[PDB]
Design an enzyme around this catalytic site. Sequence first.
Site, PDB file in Angstrom:
ATOM      1  N   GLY A 178      73.563  35.304  61.631  1.00 38.95           N
ATOM      2  CA  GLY A 178      72.216  35.905  61.691  1.00 38.95           C
ATOM      3  C   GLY A 178      72.044  37.059  62.666  1.00 38.95           C
ATOM      4  CB  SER A 179      70.798  40.031  62.972  1.00 38.52           C
ATOM      5  OG  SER A 179      72.193  40.236  62.831  1.00 38.52           O
TER       6      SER A 179
ATOM      7  CG  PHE B  68      64.578  36.304  65.403  1.00 38.02           C
ATOM      8  CD1 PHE B  68      64.784  34.973  65.016  1.00 38.02           C
ATOM      9  CD2 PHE B  68      65.021  37.325  64.562  1.00 38.02           C
ATOM     10  CE1 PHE B  68      65.428  34.660  63.822  1.00 38.02           C
ATOM     11  CE2 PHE B  68      65.667  37.025  63.363  1.00 38.02           C
ATOM     12  CZ  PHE B  68      65.872  35.687  62.992  1.00 38.02           C
ATOM     13  N   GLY B  69      67.102  36.068  68.237  1.00 38.24           N
ATOM     14  CA  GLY B  69      68.181  35.093  68.350  1.00 38.24           C
ATOM     15  C   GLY B  69      69.169  35.211  67.204  1.00 38.24           C
ATOM     16  CB  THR B  70      72.544  36.566  67.111  1.00 38.94           C
ATOM     17  OG1 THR B  70      71.941  37.857  66.968  1.00 38.94           O
ATOM     18  CG2 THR B  70      73.878  36.548  66.360  1.00 38.94           C
ATOM     19  CB  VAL B  71      72.235  32.121  63.254  1.00 32.63           C
ATOM     20  CG1 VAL B  71      72.453  30.651  63.000  1.00 32.63           C
ATOM     21  CG2 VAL B  71      70.743  32.403  63.322  1.00 32.63           C
TER      22      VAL B  71
ATOM     23  CG  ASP C 191      58.327  33.666  60.474  1.00 32.68           C
ATOM     24  OD1 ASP C 191      57.781  34.278  59.524  1.00 32.68           O
ATOM     25  OD2 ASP C 191      59.476  33.934  60.889  1.00 32.68           O
TER      26      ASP C 191
HETATM   27  C1  LIG Z   1      64.760  23.092  63.764  1.00 28.88           C
HETATM   28  C2  LIG Z   1      64.229  23.362  65.164  1.00 28.88           C
HETATM   29  C3  LIG Z   1      64.902  24.531  65.879  1.00 28.88           C
HETATM   30  S1  LIG Z   1      64.237  26.151  65.466  1.00 28.88           S
HETATM   31  O1  LIG Z   1      64.580  27.024  66.560  1.00 28.88           O
HETATM   32  O2  LIG Z   1      62.891  26.002  64.943  1.00 28.88           O
HETATM   33  N1  LIG Z   1      65.207  26.568  64.148  1.00 28.88           N
HETATM   34  C4  LIG Z   1      66.573  26.804  64.318  1.00 28.88           C
HETATM   35  C5  LIG Z   1      67.225  26.725  65.546  1.00 28.88           C
HETATM   36  C6  LIG Z   1      68.597  26.972  65.598  1.00 28.88           C
HETATM   37  C7  LIG Z   1      69.311  27.291  64.438  1.00 28.88           C
HETATM   38  F1  LIG Z   1      70.626  27.528  64.520  1.00 28.88           F
HETATM   39  C8  LIG Z   1      68.665  27.359  63.203  1.00 28.88           C
HETATM   40  C9  LIG Z   1      69.342  27.701  61.923  1.00 28.88           C
HETATM   41  O3  LIG Z   1      68.851  28.591  61.249  1.00 28.88           O
HETATM   42  N2  LIG Z   1      70.461  26.980  61.550  1.00 28.88           N
HETATM   43  C10 LIG Z   1      71.310  27.085  60.403  1.00 28.88           C
HETATM   44  C11 LIG Z   1      71.843  25.915  59.843  1.00 28.88           C
HETATM   45  N3  LIG Z   1      72.683  25.892  58.778  1.00 28.88           N
HETATM   46  C12 LIG Z   1      73.020  27.078  58.221  1.00 28.88           C
HETATM   47  N4  LIG Z   1      73.889  26.981  57.117  1.00 28.88           N
HETATM   48  C13 LIG Z   1      72.548  28.305  58.703  1.00 28.88           C
HETATM   49 BR1  LIG Z   1      73.081  29.925  57.851  1.00 28.88          BR
HETATM   50  C14 LIG Z   1      71.684  28.305  59.812  1.00 28.88           C
HETATM   51  C15 LIG Z   1      67.299  27.122  63.173  1.00 28.88           C
HETATM   52  F2  LIG Z   1      66.678  27.192  61.996  1.00 28.88           F
END
Ligand SMILES: CCCS(=O)(=O)Nc1ccc(F)c(C(=O)Nc2cnc(N)c(Br)c2)c1F
Length: 264
Positions: free
Chosen positions: A17-18, A19-22, A127
Amino acid sequence: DDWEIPDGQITVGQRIGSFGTVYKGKWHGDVAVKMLNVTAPTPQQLQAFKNEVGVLRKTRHVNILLFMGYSTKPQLAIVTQWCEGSSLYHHLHIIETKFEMIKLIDIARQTAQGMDYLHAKSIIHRDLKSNNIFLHEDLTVKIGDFGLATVKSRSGSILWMAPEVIRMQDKNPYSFQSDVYAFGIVLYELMTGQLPYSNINNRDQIIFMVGRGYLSPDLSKVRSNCPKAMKRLMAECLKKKRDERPLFPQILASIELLARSLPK
Ligand SMILES: CCCS(=O)(=O)Nc1ccc(F)c(C(=O)Nc2cnc(N)c(Br)c2)c1F
């Protein structure tokens, strides 16, 4: 008690990802990690993060992304379950996935399920949008990215923004109903497999128009196999005045009622 995950206990892999990067990683199996990738937050920043985490630990429900722990040391982070599958946005809008009307209604139900929870747990998503709703194992809905309402304050969601939200009018627009209108948009997304207002190329004109409610989504674009009551509810969920929108108890009621008179 504390869900803190010490340094070295996580092993970060490929980037997403790319508010925080995943990032995808491993911590007792495959896990998702969203590193906040700020640089080095000072002691009273630290405390407000821990504050937001505390709102996550309040959550235990199948339709809610599984909060599995947070990190401070290597960086500030939130680790969740890794999903197998693709976002509801990705199905509908990238790989043009064609769902049976029946599975559409279930996704609706599942999503409303997750919300009704957060709302009783006095959470507001702020959101709620299809790129934020996972479809796990292609059968289970997981709502995510609703954490951190403070860490962000202290663009790309315009479509789902309720009027009151859109026109940056007062200090706090975000209500339960705010989230309810964002639901109406996902409903339209399901029943039409299309983003709304696609015959308009000038963003700002949307933002303007919706804000004044001269422009709302086009109900008449739902595919014919969509239930009579589904339309009524979509419209109910999209009402311009936020007091007219129903709350998730009533929404859930309406979905579970029409779905029972369906495969027949
Ligand atoms: C669920 C509560 C935590 S939050 O900050 O509201 N959401 C939150 C926090 C941290 C994260 F990595 C994610 C997230 O998107 N995870 C995520 C999980 N699985 C996949 N396949 C992918 Br692509 C991303 C996320 F959605």
